[PDB]
């Protein structure tokens, strides 16, 4: 008596593969990358600083599976020849951090040819941010504006980077989707999907309007939020315009990651949102009992994990507190169940039907 | 044969001890949460949006009597609510844009800050912030020290506007700040300047740099200053810091082996890294110059943890240095434990490590 029909026109104007990395623009990349490495459990993989000859910026790379988190901070200007990332600008980086604080600068995706995906994007309305530049005849990097001061980066770690050698792993394996807030969803949705050809990923159905753009294989998901009390309007005010709201980090085992990330919340890691009331986890039997066992439900309660369902699969998720000083960007840890055939992207939705379940649990909790 | 140390006790105002150190950051949350894990300091007070402050976010880390403050500016679009009246968004942004992560204020507790500020300015000090009484309880004044670092005065002893943080806690053994060392291009002018308005006397000592230690009457507030074989790290400091600034802080510890076992264990998982260890010959000779102080097992612990041991006419100093704290090879941290001079412990017991360069060079050529 219910069926959800999802369509996929596969209208990608250029060949998009997978997410490549995320580049946080910092004021001091060392302390940001070392805190992220201890909280998320990511390994110090590569570096491009003074110890590698880079006299322009200190970029450090953290990895946990297919996830790459880059942390870039500008050196004192006292010619960016030794710079490994040619799109980096000292004036831009200082202005970005003074206007937005700690946050994501680049959302990088791997493409077949960055030079073509750049020209096709601009030919379809994309604002150019960095022209196609070939790195040592091996890698090509191009950047166009996504929203606000965040850029969409095309890659087809990097030259100039040196590997770091000499266990830090909590279960995070890849980046699922990067969500950004904009003042008006409409113009931002037609703009981004207007130069990538990304189709809308429908969700099965609070102060927000969300729409999910996705590539053909739907592994590159880009939800965008708009404020309708609203958490988004507070984000726009504190971030001084449109920016990335949160990053969803796929975990091989969300229970492993959550126990690893909660032991360290008070000793350098990350803090989480208030856990759902107990009646929320007394209602999981009549919701995902056929997916999660009774003991795995006890794990979600002890770890404060949100569990939502969809037409295809089940989504286990939780959110952290803001990563920096500003109540702006935070991190989402998810684990998707089902759609195995390789797992389909967006399996289980994103959590649209979770505000209704939290409202129902809070109204239930009370009165008891 | 005999070393003679003199103390004129010429403090132009009553000074007690170090109060706190305020780092100016780009993001105070990630820097403090990194410092809290590497050094083992407790989240004690906060002055951010959760307290009503829409101007900046200040977080205090404590370890015994040591207090590290971490201040980062909010966006001016939030528009009075600042608990630290000397804070300026443009100054904090321009400071960090010029020097990066570093020390802004070296706060010392005095008897009266309205006097410490006026007497200082009347004796050559460059004023940074006039005396401001906070909620009729705390008075804060600031005068320039060297570079963009300010010497902050705290009168009646975290601060009004801060909320205590509750919630076993972290503690690696660090208990107090020993001395705050700064690098300047010319030691001479900066010496007659700082001592010109403080009256701090020169602390006598028992490389590429020249050092001079200014100290208060009881010699608990120590402020060594450095000036620029191979090229000295002082000149490399001035280039990457864009002028004079604080070089390092010496964090005294009840047990340097406890603190180092905690700090080295976490160097690769978010903590702080240390300088390369001395060769084994340095610790084979560590029982001929310091054997009446350290036992055989305690000498073995220094070799395992890479600690340097120096000695002077009064006491013995066990010390070790960390790698630079941020992206720039500028600010770093020293862990110190002093033995001897017990009569309460005298300030500067064992010196500051001026003789370690000679014993290290003697140890490298022995290996
Ligand atoms: O990225 C997104 O749009 C979703 O992650 C948002 C979301 C997810 C779960 C939830 O309970 C509320 C909002
Ligand atoms: Fe999400
Ligand atoms: Fe020292």
Author numbering:
A (entry chain A): 29 to 106, 114 to 191, 202 to 211, 216 to 254, 263 to 285, 291 to 403, 411 to 437
B (entry chain B): 30 to 108, 116 to 193, 202 to 211, 215 to 253, 263 to 284, 289 to 403, 411 to 434
Q: Which passages does the manuscript contain on this structure?
A:
As an important member, 4-hydroxyphenylpyruvate dioxygenase (HPPD) catalyzes the complex transformation of 4-hydroxyphenylpyruvate acid (HPPA) to homogentisic acid (HGA), a key step in the tyrosine catabolic pathway that is common to all the aerobic organisms. In plants, HGA is a key intermediate in the biosynthesis of tocopherols and plastoquinones, which are essential compounds for the photosynthesis. Inhibition of the enzyme results in foliage bleaching of plants and eventually death, and thus HPPD inhibitors have been developed as herbicides for many years. Each monomeric unit consists of nine α-helices and sixteen β-strands that form two barrel-shaped structural domains: a conserved C-terminal domain containing the active site and a diversified N-terminal loop domain.
In this work, we successfully resolved the crystal structure of AtHPPD complexed with its natural substrate HPPA for the first time. The crystals belong to space group P 21 and comprise four molecules per asymmetric unit, which consists of two homodimers ( and ). Electron density for a ligand chelating with the metal ion was only seen in molecular A. The structure of HPPA can be built into the density map. Similarly, in HPPD-HPPA complex, the α-ketoglutarate moiety of HPPA in a bidentate interaction results in an octahedral coordination geometry involving the facial triad. In addition to chelation with metal ion, the phenolic hydroxyl of HPPA forms a hydrogen bond with the side chain of Asn423 on the C-terminal α-helix (α9). A 75° horizontal rotation, the benzene ring of HPPA shapes a T-π interaction with Phe381 and a weak hydrophobic interaction with the surrounding residues (such as Leu368 and Leu427, in ), leading to the current orientation of the aromatic moiety of HPPA. In the crystal structure, the values of D3 and D4 are 1.19 Å and 1.53 Å, which are more consistent with the structure of HPPD(Co2+)-HPPA(ketone), suggesting that the HPPA is more likely to be a ketone in the crystal. Besides, Gln293 underwent a conformation change during the binding of HPPA. More importantly, this conformation change made Gln293 involved in the formation of H-bond network of Ser267-Asn282-Gln307 which surrounds the HPPA in the active site. On the basis of the structural comparison, the remarkable characteristic of inactive state is the H-bond network formed by Glu394-Gln379-Asn423, whereas the key feature for the active state is the formation of the H-bond network by Ser267-Asn282-Gln307-Gln293.
